[PDB]
């Protein structure tokens, strides 16, 4: 009866910063996954606990579609059981993940000649994120025992850093748009289906 709204995610003009990653909840709709996987276009397309060519035969209770921009270097961190600045402090997948990670080079939308400083990531954090946790705190990071009182200085660092996306960056330092599809199947009713 309803067509799934994944297009809001894949065709969005601008993507979220990874620390403030977007999540769209998909429910009560049908979708044709072959439109997604038969478009080439993807530098990464890896699934866990599901097969892509099987997806059209499946129904799920909900589907989550998380999206954000990270550096090409870092796409390897969007996978179960990883570590690094992205997996630890920005976007973490659980060990028992069932879903697909999808990425494509976005150098020509997301990079700009003098640097696009609009995409950010979290550099400083006291502990690792839980799976699917989203921390948007902008509090000054206290690296010593003296309070920072909202002032940057020694031992007091703004926790987020800007990517510097310039089109001349090496491919590993170029922006990549990532979409993480999660396939949640609680119980009834499974209302997100293939044709």
């Amino acid at each position, epitope marked *: *009866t*309803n*067509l*799934c*709204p*994944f*297009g809001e995610v*894949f*065709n969005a003009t601008r993507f979220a910063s990874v620390y403030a990653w977007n999540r769209k909840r998909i429910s009560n*709709c*049908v*979708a*044709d*996954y*072959s*439109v*997604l996987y038969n*478009s080439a276009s993807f530098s990464t397309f890896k699934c866990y606990g599901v097969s892509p060519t099987k997806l059209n035969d499946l129904c799920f209770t909900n589907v989550y579609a998380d999206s954000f921009v990270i550096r090409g270097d870092e796409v390897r961190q969007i996978a179960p059981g990883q570590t690094g600045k992205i997996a630890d402090y920005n976007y973490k997948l659980p060990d028992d993940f069932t879903g697909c990670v999808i990425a494509w080079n976005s150098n020509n939308l997301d990079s700009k000649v003098g640097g696009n400083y609009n995409y950010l990531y979290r550099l400083f954090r006291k502990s690792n994120l839980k799976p699917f946790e989203r921390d948007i705190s902008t509090e000054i990071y206290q690296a010593g025992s003296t309070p920072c009182n909202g002032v940057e200085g020694f031992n007091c660092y703004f926790p987020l850093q800007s990517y510097g996306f310039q089109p001349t960056n090496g491919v590993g330092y170029q922006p990549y748009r990532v979409v993480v599809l999660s396939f949640e199947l609680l119980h009834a009713p499974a209302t997100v289906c293939g*044709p």
Partner: nanobody
Amino acid sequence: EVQLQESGGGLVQPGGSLRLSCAASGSISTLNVMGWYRQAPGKQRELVARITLDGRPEYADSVKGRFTITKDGAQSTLYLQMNNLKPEDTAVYFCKLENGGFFYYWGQGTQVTVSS
């Protein structure tokens, strides 16, 4: 993969009629939804009418009882029959094709003007 060709617009007087056509070509899933949208000057894009996946038409409130939307599957073309046009119907009209639930595509945009 999907191209959309729009035609049928221009300037008419209040009370007049137009028919908009959106011709859809390319690689299109059996699961797709087409609709007509419009953008009045200095306003946001709004849905006018669309054919749901059920084949059932859906209309914005300001046009219900005046506009009729149909889909000729043979030409994969989407028709917006506009009766009893009003100056507030003036806008650039766009057709949208939502392909398989994962991508969408917009037409170039068709000027409609209702004035005397």
